[PDB]
Design a protein around this ligand. Structure first.
Ligand SMILES: CC(=O)N[C@H]1[C@H](O[C@@H]2[C@H](O[C@]3(C(=O)O)C[C@H](O)[C@@H](NC(C)=O)[C@H]([C@H](O)[C@H](O)CO)O3)[C@@H](O)[C@H](O[C@H]3[C@H](O)[C@@H](O)[C@H](O)O[C@@H]3CO)O[C@@H]2CO)O[C@H](CO)[C@H](O)[C@@H]1O[C@@H]1O[C@H](CO)[C@H](O)[C@H](O)[C@H]1O
Ligand SMILES: CC(=O)N[C@H]1[C@H](O[C@@H]2[C@H](O[C@]3(C(=O)O)C[C@H](O)[C@@H](NC(C)=O)[C@H]([C@H](O)[C@H](O)CO)O3)[C@@H](O)[C@H](O[C@H]3[C@H](O)[C@@H](O)[C@H](O)O[C@@H]3CO)O[C@@H]2CO)O[C@H](CO)[C@H](O)[C@@H]1O[C@@H]1O[C@H](CO)[C@H](O)[C@H](O)[C@H]1O
Lengths: 159, 159
């Protein structure tokens, strides 16, 4: 049955989904703030993650202002990071809207489509497959580009 | 293709969609406020609408505090209001979240599934079919249960 679930992710924490995200489902992260002038990351300023049942990082979205790039990657929980995909000009991806932002991920089965507000910044070919059982938003209190609490909304049972 | 579109609807206005919403698509209205003590409507306090290309109300969602009900209906532009589907106890539907709210509409072709926050309030069997080409949020700045501006986010091209 189609459903909507809402989660409040505080910076530096994760949440387990009550309804898993699989092929055809959607997850949108909402930030009630946007600080594109934050200091240097360590190396990341902000990261958004979708975890599989087995603990794998299905999709890792990392925003690095200092390197002016958004990174997309995957990795096993006990393995190394795999092949990174990069999008240049972080600030430009959020152009049009200020004071807040929205990041959407579509699980298309063999790929993850990431959209910043209304702009699809990448069709990321999966390096690791499976359904998402957990999410996390990692960042410090001083250098995150998003608010202290990031809200995640999932639309599941779509297919 | 799958896409995300954002619209800011000021009370009493409507917007034409850049991407029409059809079977398998989703639209969520976000309110940055929630006043269940707004007072008696005239008769409605707030309405959210999905219009067909010809102006027909495909889905009319009316929040009526004085009657303590949420009304769902449809009608042709020159026709009478059709059969109302009433959900009682407005406060219960928004329970769990204060200060704001979100109303989601799933277009399943034969029905419109409406979800307030995480709670599915109705599986509205359509009385009129067709694609949604426009949306509206109607209310006065005096008695609306939502903020002056409501943001509509559509997820289209899903099917
Ligand atoms: C800290 C950092 O920026 N890490 C990113 C890394 O950048 C490389 C250097 O970092 C190390 C690391 O700690 O991972 C340094 C280690 O000594 C290296 N290990 C070994 C055995 O040599 C690793 C290793 O080379 C990579 O992991 C291989 O992929 O890299 C980083 O210090 C260096 O920074 C430059 C800087 O850009 C330049 O301006 C300055 O003048 O010199 C500095 C030092 O040379 O750049 C290195 C090359 O990139 O690069 C990897 C990708 O290759 C990652 O981006 C890594 O960050 C992780 O990325 C993950 C997602 O892919 C995830 O976001 C993690 O949270 C990140 O830490
Ligand atoms: C103003 C209102 O509440 N309208 C809703 C209506 O309420 C009925 C009475 O309103 C009329 C009307 O103007 O529509 C009065 C007309 O004289 C009636 N027409 C005829 C030919 O008799 C119509 C007609 O019966 C209906 O349209 C048929 O569906 O109804 C309203 O005055 C009456 O008020 C009661 C009050 O509810 C009660 O608490 C109080 O103690 O006594 C009052 C006087 O008796 O209540 C009537 C209830 O039927 O009812 C219809 C549904 O039957 C709608 O709810 C209508 O509101 C419209 O709803 C639409 C969606 O379905 C849409 O949201 C429109 O914007 C609403 O105006």
């Amino acid at each position: 049955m189609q459903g909507v679930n809402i989660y409040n992710i505080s910076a530096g924490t994760s949440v387990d989904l009550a309804a898993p995200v699989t092929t055809g489902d959607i997850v949108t992260f909402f930030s009630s703030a946007l600080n594109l002038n934050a200091g240097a990351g360590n190396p990341n300023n902000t990261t958004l993650n979708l975890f599989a049942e087995n603990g794998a990082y299905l999709l890792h979205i990392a925003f690095r202002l200092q390197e002016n790039v958004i990174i997309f990657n995957s990795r096993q929980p006990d393995g190394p990071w795999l092949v990174e995909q990069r999008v240049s000009d972080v600030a430009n991806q959020f152009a049009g809207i200020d004071g807040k932002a929205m990041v959407t991920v579509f699980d298309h089965g063999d790929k993850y489509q990431v959209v910043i507000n209304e702009k699809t910044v990448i069709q990321y070919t999966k390096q690791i497959s499976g359904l998402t059982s957990s999410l996390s938003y990692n960042a410090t209190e001083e250098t995150s580009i998003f608010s202290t609490v990031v809200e995640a909304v999932t639309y599941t049972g779509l297919a």
